[PDB]
Amino acid sequence: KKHLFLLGGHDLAMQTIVQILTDRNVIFKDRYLQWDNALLSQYEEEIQQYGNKEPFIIYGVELKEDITPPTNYIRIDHHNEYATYPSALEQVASILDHPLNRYQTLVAANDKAYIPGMLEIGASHEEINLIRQEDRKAQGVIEDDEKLAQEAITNGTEKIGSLYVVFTTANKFSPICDRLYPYEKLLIYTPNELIYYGKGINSIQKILKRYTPISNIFWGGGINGFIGTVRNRLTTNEILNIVEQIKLLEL
Ligand SMILES: C[S@+](CC[C@H](N)C(=O)O)C[C@H]1O[C@@H](n2cnc3c(N)ncnc32)[C@H](O)[C@@H]1OP(=O)(O)OC[C@H]1O[C@@H](n2cnc3c(N)ncnc32)[C@H](O)[C@@H]1O
Numbered sequence: 001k002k003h004l005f006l007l008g009g010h011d012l013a014m015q016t017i018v019q020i021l022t023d024r025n026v027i028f029k030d031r032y033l034q035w036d037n038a039l040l041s042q043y044e045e046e047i048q049q050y051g052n053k054e055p056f057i058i059y060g061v062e063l064k065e066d067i068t069p070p071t072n073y074i075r076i077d078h079h080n081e082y083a084t085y086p087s088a089l090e091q092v093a094s095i096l097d098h099p100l101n102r103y104q105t106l107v108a109a110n111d112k113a114y115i116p117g118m119l120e121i122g123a124s125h126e127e128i129n130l131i132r133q134e135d136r137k138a139q140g141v142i143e144d145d146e147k148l149a150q151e152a153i154t155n156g157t158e159k160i161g162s163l164y165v166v167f168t169t170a171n172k173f174s175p176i177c178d179r180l181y182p183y184e185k186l187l188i189y190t191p192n193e194l195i196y197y198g199k200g201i202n203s204i205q206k207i208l209k210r211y212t213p214i215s216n217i218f219w220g221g222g223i224n225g226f227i228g229t230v231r232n233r234l235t236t237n238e239i240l241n242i243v244e245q246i247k248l249l250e251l
Pocket residue numbers: 009011035036037062110111112113114135171172173174177195197198218220221224225226230231
């Protein structure tokens with residue numbers, strides 16, 4: 001069986017996947033996608049060419065199946081119903097019998113379980129900082145993202161019980177998490193988007209499903225990971241109601 005890898009949205013783990021695939025002479029396609037455009041249809045041409053074509057197995061790495069996969073397609077993912085699975089990076093390495101070196105295992109732990117993940121395999125303070133900086137960079141965060149993050153923390157943050165609630169107009173949320181960490185619970189929202197981080201995502205999922213179909217929701221990172229809504233799918237009043245419901249859990 002011959003492998004073809006189709007890559008989803010970029011971050012440090014996806015960049016590490018590119019390196020391993022490049023080193024191992026694997027057939028792969030990388031359209032420089034991001035978290036909010038990682039659609040299988042970005043690779044429609046490749047699906048037409050290799051789909052249902054006997055020798056090949058097509059591995060889709062964190063791609064939304066907006067078109068019907070062919071019979072030789074395998075989804076590689078660790079979100080939603082697969083939120084307990086290892087990072088896509090670890091799954092790809094296993095497919096290729098690739099032993100992850102130390103840096104790569106830190107990348108994988110950060111990708112699946114953030115700073116807590118890196119701490120439980122003994123990452124140092126310098127290692128954690130390099131990984132976070134390189135992850136934000138691979139996501140495309142820039143200076144104006146980091147500036148808006150500081151603004152939201154100074155002027156748009158309030159703490160209710162153990163829950164931080166941050167209103168922001170920032171495009172990228174990861175700079176906010178990295179500035180507020182450590183925290184137990186964090187809710188970041190905009191007029192048309194929210195992401196919740198930390199303890200008890202399952203009760204957050206119960207709230208979200210009263211307002212929107214599951215196709216507008218994503219989660220991962222484990223029991224106390226993250227759960228969010230796809231940008232511009234919910235109205236401001238729906239977001240505001242959800243925010244109130246999440247605050248009520250602190251009572
Ligand atoms: C938590 S991140 C924040 C995205 C947010 N849009 C932003 O602006 O920064 C978003 C995750 O949701 C996924 N996602 C799915 N669909 C969409 C969509 N339509 N729009 C946006 N995001 C979508 C996306 O792939 C990513 O998962 P990943 O697994 O690829 O990456 C996880 C990232 O979060 C970090 N992370 C992992 N666990 C945690 C945690 N518990 N707390 C904070 N960060 C974590 C990890 O280091 C890595 O950088």
